[PDB]
Nucleic acid binder design. Sequence first.
RNA 1: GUUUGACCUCAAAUCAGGUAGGAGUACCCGCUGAACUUAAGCAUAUCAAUAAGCGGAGGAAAAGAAACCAACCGGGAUUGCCUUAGUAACGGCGAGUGAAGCGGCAAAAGCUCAAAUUUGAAAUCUGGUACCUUCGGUGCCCGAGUUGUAAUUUGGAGAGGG
Lengths: 122, 83, 186, 130, 28, 184, 80, 51, 198
Amino acid sequence: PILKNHFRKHWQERVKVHFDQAGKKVSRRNARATRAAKIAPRPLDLLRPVVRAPTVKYNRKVRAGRGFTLAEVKAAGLTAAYARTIGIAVDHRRQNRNQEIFDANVQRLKEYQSKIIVFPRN
Amino acid sequence: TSMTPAPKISYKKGAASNRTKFVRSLVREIAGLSPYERRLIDLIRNSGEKRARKVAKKRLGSFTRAKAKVEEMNNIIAASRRH
Amino acid sequence: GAYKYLEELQRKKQSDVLRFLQRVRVWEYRQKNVIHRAARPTRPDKARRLGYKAKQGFVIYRVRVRRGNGVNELKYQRSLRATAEERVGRRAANLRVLNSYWVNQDSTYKYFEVILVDPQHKAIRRDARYNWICDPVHKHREARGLTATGKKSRGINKGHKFNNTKAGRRKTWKRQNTLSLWRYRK
Amino acid sequence: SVRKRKMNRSSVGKATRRNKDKQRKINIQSNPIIAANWDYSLTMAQNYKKLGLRAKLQTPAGGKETEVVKKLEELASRSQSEREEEWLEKLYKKHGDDYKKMFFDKKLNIYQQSEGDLKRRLLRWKKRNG
Amino acid sequence: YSKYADGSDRIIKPEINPVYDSDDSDAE
Amino acid sequence: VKWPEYVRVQRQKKILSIRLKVPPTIAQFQYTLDRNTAAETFKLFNKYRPETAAEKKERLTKEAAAVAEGASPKPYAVKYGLNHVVALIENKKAKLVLIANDVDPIELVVFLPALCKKMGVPYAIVKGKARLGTLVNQKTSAVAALTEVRAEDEAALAKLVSTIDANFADKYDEVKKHWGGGIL
Amino acid sequence: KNKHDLVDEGFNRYTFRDTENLPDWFLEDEKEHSKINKPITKEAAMAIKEKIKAMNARPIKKVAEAKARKRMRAVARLEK
Amino acid sequence: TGLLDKNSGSSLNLTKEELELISKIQRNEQTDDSINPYEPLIDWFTRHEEV
Amino acid sequence: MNKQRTLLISSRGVNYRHRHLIQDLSGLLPHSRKEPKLDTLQQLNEIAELYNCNNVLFFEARKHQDLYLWLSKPPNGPTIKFYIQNLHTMDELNFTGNCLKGSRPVLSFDQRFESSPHYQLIKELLVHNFGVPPNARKSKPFIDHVMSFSIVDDKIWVRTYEISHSTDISLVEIGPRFVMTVILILEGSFGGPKIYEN
RNA sequence: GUUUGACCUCAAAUCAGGUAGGAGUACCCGCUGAACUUAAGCAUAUCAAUAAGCGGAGGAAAAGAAACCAACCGGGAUUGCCUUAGUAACGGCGAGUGAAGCGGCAAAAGCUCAAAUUUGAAAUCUGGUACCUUCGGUGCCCGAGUUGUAAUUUGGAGAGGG
């Protein structure tokens, strides 16, 4: 009546068509298989925390965080430097303010520590 | 409920530091004064803080700059003359 | 220590001591070549916090550049400091430009003291704190603006304000100006 | 092309590498217990659930004791120098157990060490001896 | 010297006299 | 006559060192300790040469050749790094701090005489960084300090303090004032 | 700007410098490079061009000669 | 000065003192007089020894 | 007998239109000591103390559409917080007419300004702050415009009309036409308990 | 002592040992930079921060562990993909230009210096040189170096004692 066509530039030079969608899925699965073949008994990814999303819109939702904290790791009963060797992602810049999020993470860490089998250095 | 978070860098904002106060003031007396500050300290004694802050504000960036600077120069005078 | 006394000394540049120091040295640097090598840093404090270790393989070159640029304001939007870093990059092509600082200035010339590491020196090739410069991904960092001042002039930082140049302005232009079409059309 | 045209024409020979079948099936290396019990006909995640071990700790996008006992089996299953020993010999023979006097001695406790350091090191000396 | 309307004390400064000085970026 | 470039530069720098009016934190140097007191400072300072690399190597192999097969006090030496001297001064561990008058960047050692007057450390600006270098196994030293001392040399050191206070600090109370270099 | 404003501006990067005791081979390298690039106007450039212009700059002779030049140019473009 | 005065149509001139002040900017020559370029360093901080 | 001076200051966060208001008020007021920018509340008294200002016009903008004028007397005067809703600047093309740059205006007012001591205070402060001294240094003699102030719906509508002559008199409206909604009045200058609220 | 000797700075040598240039250039990092065109004729604008030109790298480059985003019940290096979204904003408010946070997902990883004395000991390093188990190690020697190489310390603090 509206329409805006951004074809005033030399658009025909930069046209990326993703024919390799099927090729790149295979490529990532081969990558995962290789990583799991090198990291044999371990999962494939670090233990990630539970986290509340920002903004009025999404604060209903609970999502994965980057890492726990020095606080959540200490309350679980271990050190940050040792947590990384057991494959627990640690976030130094994140803060602890909500009690429900805190306790959920501590129990996630505690249940993780019961389920694991750490190998000795010998 | 709140969980009383860990303290950060600018919460103990500018921790006093007895040594750096000493070092800044130690260099201040040794280095002398910049040519405008040299005019500024003459301007306090003759014309006063009124015109002194006016020149300092034009010279520096903002008014909060001119506050700290004229007071700094007033402490140069307060120490050099009396004690 | 001793360098805190130096650091806070060089923050006063028009103060009568450093006024006199700068008066003698500006003239003395005019009498020498444009690009010549410094015996040792004039400001060892600022050299050291920009990562100059006084050991074999570490070089200080002193450099001079003309100032300025509506014909007389046809701009040339690259810095004086990046120009200086590039010139010492070409005269000393075996070295790698680590960092550079301001030393003295004038009506016509701004001076700098570039700091250079010898990646072929065995006192650099060992010691695991500086042997990263031997990796061939650092051949002429000053020519691609990977130094402190180059990253400034490129506008590479974090935030809202640097959205047009955060991954590099050429990269982000090429990315956002691409008609991306999938197998099953979105 | 320009270079490829010559290389497909020359008598040098191509450096042919047939490394395509090796891209899919990479042998498991880091654990011999897993190396013996890994069905290569199954995938990665299928070989994890077959053994029991959790493959992804975050819940995946999409739709989804035989060996772990053997692991559990293999997981449930600092001396002193000549000069240090002879130093502790000297301290015990001259003092015995008076750690206050033992650490205030300039001649034998040359390194001005505490009482706790001395009783710990002497008990290491006493366990290795009679 | 004096106080505010609610519980707090104020400092009565003398009134500000608008005087065109020796320098005020503008002359007669 | 026609001289080289660098020769002309250092001669020009020499006459420039004289003919300019200079700030009083500089020219507080060159108003330096005289010949007798300088020789007497070094007659003490030469008794505390830091044990040279060869001497240290031979002694510590003597420790190994003896002690491995079949008590000493802490030894006293002069203290010689600028980071370490300005560490020692302000901790008041310095009894005599010797400062070179000729330093490559002058800006390095400009705070030091006045920081010594502040802390109450009895300092002396002695002539020559080479001359300080000799007593310390280095080419140059910029600074040399004497923290602790043997008791034989203690009374001599205390008198060296009092001689330097009288000879240096009292004769050069005018040097905190007066911009140097007004030579016609 | 009044007197008081310029007395502020007068304290430069280059103030507090002796000039009478110093040798000429040093001052002739300072004075070349001791010029602070202050902003200009067209209004000032007008008057300074009106100040330098001397008496014999534009006589009757050189006016007549200027027309004698331009007539030759107007002829040279009818030579083609 | 080449410009016209606002008070009157007559040409705006400059005082001797102002002309002196312009020259003393351009050769830098100490604008504010009754000051010493070379004051003695009054040690306002080193006067009192630290304990 | 009347001797006053205004300080025109700004905050970081002032947009295009609001900058044009500081431009045009600095034009209309011959006693306007125009100042560039301020960043932060308590400082404004001291700025006024430097230039011998009898008045301080602090133009704030919190959200970038909004405008909040903090009219004041510096030393101990009652400061007034406004919210200016409607805006039509000097450089809007529909307005026709030249006032003399900083000539003496004639202040027009309303009945309902005398209804309370509240509106009486803003009436007085608009007389000597928004008005003019009889011998301001940049002030032009022959009077050429007015300042129309009138209250309707609890807010004062401000207009500046150039008087038009013919050879009795007309007047064509120009300049900043804007409402002023009196938000807040402090007891002292930017400090102390709040007298009036809405 | 009118002598001898420390340094400092500046040189030279077919000195010992090294290293830089040129090619390729799809992608990548910079510098420099138009016009045809399109807009109503058209100094803005548009094509376009494009092409051409010049420099500089690698298998990737660049970016990157906040002087970040937000306004929440807060998230947490970068990069990339879907989404935001032709949205916010810009523009003779014209032709046209035009993001980002959030959410989902791919992939994920963290660290290191300078600035506080090793001062009961320059603990550090390069080269020469003789052997040896030689991408090196050991011995001896010349040096670099206190105008600061090592160990400790980097905010998630950290350090000295008990």
